[PDB]
Design a protein around this nucleic acid. Structure first.
Lengths: 272, 164, 195, 50, 158
RNA sequence: UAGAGGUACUUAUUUCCAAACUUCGAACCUCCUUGUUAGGCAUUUACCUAACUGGAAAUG
RNA sequence: AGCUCAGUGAGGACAGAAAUCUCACGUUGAGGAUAAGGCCAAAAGCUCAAUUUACUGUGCCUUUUUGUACUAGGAUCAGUU
RNA sequence: GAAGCGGCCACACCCGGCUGGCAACAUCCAGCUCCACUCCGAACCUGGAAAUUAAGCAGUCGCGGGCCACAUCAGUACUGGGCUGGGCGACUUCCCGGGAACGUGCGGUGCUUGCUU
């Protein structure tokens, strides 16, 4: 029947990958060259804009590495965008750009440098801008990707991200794809844009809403200053507690009870 | 609903036998049938017996997905009257079968191209075989979603009204 | 032919096996290490009878085949290929060497070609066994007396307490069998660890 | 013809007659080190005395 | 056939322990060094750019230069008669912060804790110092388990 | 080395081994530290940092 | 930048111990110009694409100082691609 | 409790069962532009949201394989000093010091850094 791969000799020999390599979330060859700084700069922070896109949410952060672990300085998240205007389509391309503006303008209002670095930057006797690097992650770096949508939001927000590079931006290409289903197929418009009809925003409105989204983000960027954080964290456990409790651990006494009742069927008790 | 078996794909390949303009003709046999421009297989070894070099075009092959793969099996199994052997099925519940006498599937006007025989092979899977394929959060599927051999035979009788 | 084995008794180098590096090696005199009723049991042949070596030295392959043939032919004569089981618990892996000599270039490029296989013993290494029934324990001791004159140095013949070739005393064997912890392989005893 | 190749019998004896600890003059070694660091370390000293 | 190569007689030096193959964690690159710091050189076998020599494995030194990826380390090899100094350059992935001084620095701060707090109450100070392990005071011992060890009669057990 | 269990191989075993085998691993060795250590203050820099009433280094 | 190899297991017209195709397991045993030993898995392997840093100039370090060199390698500075 | 970001990198891995989805993660649905398949919207990419916890994920169970921990194993193996000790020799008592491994027995099977609803 051929060789059994996976003996004791296999599993004893087997080195594991780290953890977030196993869970398959970080490339550690990226990360080790994202973090590194020259030893002549010593203990100096350099910031990195994380911008990972799940389904529904576009997440965007600014991170400093430390030996204990990474530390977010400021965060923004596309489920906040209902407050500023954008009710639906929270992983659009224009939704990804809108989070880019939030991460910029919140970070600069925390550091108290809002009057400086208003527009994009594009050189002496002038204050140098924030170096913030892009962490993409395992998402593939192709042109017109939603990772670089978050980048363009951060650059137009304020921050000097280095790169080499207004359609797709105020709701175009969404708005054209509405018209192709609306005009021809009609059945498919009900499938594809169910929620949109429900509001209903319509094809034309996408251009209008985003501009006033970019107005309101630039005016009132920071939000939800909650304290203390401990009593906030306690309320979330009660608020989001499964109705059905998770199975809990059997103690060492009641395990040996159940072991023996199985062993009574096949004989030779009791022990372990 | 998400324990439904479906056809994931139907991978054709055609090896004519022997080298030359039989291979580029066998591409046109695939291209008109499948509606897809065919990938050309290269060899890995010189074997003088069968008439093969190390680096040369042996075969053509192509990978069909969606409604198109389900359509061809309906015409292809109608050659054998919806009948194949029980020992066709592999341990994952994937099966295949031969169609010599090309044109059966397959209707066409031969002139420049010859007739060339067919290696069809089907891949039955559940919904969530995304997770093995993907990059971000790659992992293994469960024991439950893995298709057994004996469940795959029950699908074949249910789907095509077939017999073994 | 051969050297006298007083040449190659004591151990004056590191061990030197048949490998990639040794190359030009003749195969040993031993092929069979084990004779008699090989397919038997722990329970069928409980009584055991060992030959222990009382020296740290080399044992030749030629000695070990002389000891097998003298053992078999006595046990064949008495009881007649039924009860007994003979085993040899040395395997010759160490390769000897010669400078040859046989005008001449002696002591220059002294390293020499391999001559024969050998086994490196250790003080109280058993170099033979006979497993048998209580009827022919008498015959087993008289066999290993004759086999001891084949070997270099001096060497004690001992009736073991433990069953078969298993590491279990007769007192322990009944307790484990009764407990049901131990089990029987085709030959020898396989323990049950309850895991 | 064939005499001895080497020995270390009484290497130890000779070494211990005197293993003197050779002390370093200063920890900086300005032939090495970064020039960009030492360049600035000059302009620290030059600016101070004025 | 004795050879004087660079990486010679290092079969087991530059081996990678066991289940510690691969590149190191990116926490290692985030660490920092200074001039004057005591550091021990032990090698990553994987990372081949900017190794030390075989000889300065397991060898303490002091940092004198620091440079974008690498640290100039001063280490005292024993030559023939005399202990020479050796100016190494070596990368940070073969270099760790040594805990030679951490016994000494613990005591100095523990002494200042004692020397101040004696004056705070004040009162009057007893002077602590290190001392080798010393012979014991007299004292009295009641046990209530006393075995009686004897040599048994010898039996072979084979 | 020599049997048993599976469909010559193979799953567990067993007799007995390696200077150019290692999943463990001593003894004997080897190297570093053990008096000044914690700070605070403000000058210098064309260097570092987004920024200086910071960092880095040397002068007090 | 993307992908994973050697191999084993089952399958698949002609198809055979070996042609091309498919799924599954696969800690690296393959491969990395060659000796032998290390080292390596979203790579240092294989594939595709664009390229010339296989570049210019002075000190410094290690092998090696009980003997300083050349060879080879290493960390920089000053350029430029 | 869930999610992005991580630290030590199997007490976390690997096989197989069972119990959960308010939001969240995900499967999933569709293919027009950005761009993607040396063929294929499978992947990658973009735009969704109908119905599900079947899978991933989370928690948990197994006289599970492995991994980790303690105790035995054992004052055994080996070993640093010392003898006008023994022994034809090979090797080895003893005196002053240090001291394993495999195996077996019992236990365990991830602990939380900073931000968010």
């Amino acid at each position: 029947s051929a060789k059994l791969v996976k003996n004791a000799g296999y599993f004893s020999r087997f080195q594991t990958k780290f953890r977030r390599r196993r869970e398959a979330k970080t490339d550690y060859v990226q990360r080790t060259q994202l973090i590194q700084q020259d030893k002549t700069k010593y203990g100096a922070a350099k910031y990195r804009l994380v911008a990972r896109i799940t389904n529904t949410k576009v997440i965007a952060q600014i991170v400093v590495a430390e030996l204990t672990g990474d530390k977010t300085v400021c965060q923004a998240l596309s489920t906040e965008l209902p407050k500023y205007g954008i009710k639906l389509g929270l992983s659009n391309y224009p939704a990804a750009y809108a989070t880019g503006l939030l991460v910029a303008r919140r970070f600069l209002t925390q550091m108290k440098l809002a009057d400086v670095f208003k527009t994009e930057i594009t050189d002496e006797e002038n204050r140098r801008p924030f170096k913030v690097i892009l962490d993409v992650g395992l998402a593939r770096t192709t042109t017109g990707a939603k990772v670089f949508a978050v980048m363009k939001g951060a650059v137009d927000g304020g921050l000097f991200i280095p790169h080499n590079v207004q359609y797709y931006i105020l709701g175009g290409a969404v708005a054209d794809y509405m018209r192709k289903l609306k005009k021809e197929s009609e059945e498919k418009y009900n499938k594809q844009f169910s929620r949109y009809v429900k509001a209903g925003i319509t094809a034309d409105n996408l251009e209008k809403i985003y501009k006033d989204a970019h107005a309101a983000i630039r005016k009132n960027p920071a939000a939800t200053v909650i304290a203390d954080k401990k009593k906030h964290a306690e309320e979330m456990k009660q608020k989001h507690a499964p109705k059905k409790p998770q199975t809990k651990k059997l103690s060492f006494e009641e395990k040996r009870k159940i072991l023996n009742e199985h062993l009574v069927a096949a004989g030779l008790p009791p022990r372990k | 609903k998400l324990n439904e078996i479906r056809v994931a794909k139907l991978c054709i390949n055609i090896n004519p036998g022997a080298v030359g303009d039989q291979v580029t003709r066998a591409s046109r046999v695939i291209e008109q049938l499948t509606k897809q421009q065919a990938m050309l297989a290269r060899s890995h070894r010189t074997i003088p017996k069968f008439g093969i070099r190390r680096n040369d075009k042996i075969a053509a092959y192509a990978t069909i997905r969606g409604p198109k793969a389900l359509e061809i099996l309906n015409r292809a199994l109608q050659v054998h009257d919806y009948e194949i052997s029980g020992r066709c099925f592999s341990i994952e519940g994937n099966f295949g079968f031969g169609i010599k006498e090309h044109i059966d599937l397959g209707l066409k006007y031969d002139r420049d191209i010859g007739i060339h025989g067919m290696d069809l092979y089907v891949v039955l899977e559940r919904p969530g075989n995304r997770i093995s394929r993907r990059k971000h959060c790659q992992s293994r599927i469960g024991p439950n979603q893995r298709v057994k051999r004996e469940e795959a035979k029950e699908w074949f009788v249910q789907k095509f009204n077939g017999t073994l | 032919g051969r050297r006298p084995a007083r040449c190659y008794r004591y151990i004056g180098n590191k061990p030197y096996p048949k490998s990639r590096f040794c190359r030009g090696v003749p195969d040993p005199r031993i092929i069979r290490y084990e004779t008699g009723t090989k397919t038997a049991h722990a329970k069928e042949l409980p009584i055991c009878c060992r030959l222990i070596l009382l020296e740290h030295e080399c044992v030749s392959s030629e000695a070990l085949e002389a000891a097998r043939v003298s053992s078999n032919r006595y046990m064949m004569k008495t009881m007649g290929k039924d009860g007994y089981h003979i085993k040899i618990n040395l395997h010759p892996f160490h390769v000897l060497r010669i400078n040859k000599m046989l005008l001449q270039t002696g002591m220059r490029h002294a390293f020499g070609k391999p001559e024969g296989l050998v086994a490196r013993a250790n003080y109280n290494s058993q170099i033979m066994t006979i497993r048998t029934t209580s009827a022919g324990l008498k015959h087993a001791l008289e066999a290993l007396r004759r086999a001891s004159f084949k070997f270099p140095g001096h060497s004690r013949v001992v009736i073991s307490n433990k069953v078969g070739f298993t590491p279990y005393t007769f007192e322990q064997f009944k307790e484990l069998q009764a407990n049901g912890q131990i089990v029987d392989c085709g030959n020898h005893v396989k323990r049950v660890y309850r895991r | 013809a064939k005499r001895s190749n080497t020995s270390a019998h009484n290497r130890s004896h000779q070494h211990h007659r005197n293993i003197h600890k050779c002390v370093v003059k200063k920890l900086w070694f300005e032939k090495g080190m970064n020039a960009k660091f030492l360049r600035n370390a000059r302009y620290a000293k030059a600016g101070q005395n004025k | 056939g004795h050879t004087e190569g660079l990486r010679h007689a290092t079969r087991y030096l530059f081996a990678r322990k066991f289940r510690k193959h691969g590149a190191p964690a990116p926490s290692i690159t985030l660490r920092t060094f200074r001039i004057g710091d005591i550091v021990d050189i032990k090698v990553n076998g994987a990372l081949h750019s900017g190794m030390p020599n075989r000889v300065y494995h397991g060898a303490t030194g002091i940092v004198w230069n620091v440079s974008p990826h690498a640290v100039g380390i001063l280490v005292k090899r024993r030559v023939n008669n005399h202990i020479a100094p050796k100016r190494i350059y070596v990368r940070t992935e073969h270099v760790f912060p040594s805990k030679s001084k951490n016994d000494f620095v613990a005591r100095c701060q523990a002494n200042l804790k004692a020397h101040e707090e004696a004056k705070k109450a004040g009162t009057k100070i007893a002077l602590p110092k290190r001392l080798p392990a010393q012979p014991r005071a007299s004292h009295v011992v009641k046990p209530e388990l006393i075995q009686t060890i004897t040599d048994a009669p010898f039996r072979e057990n084979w």
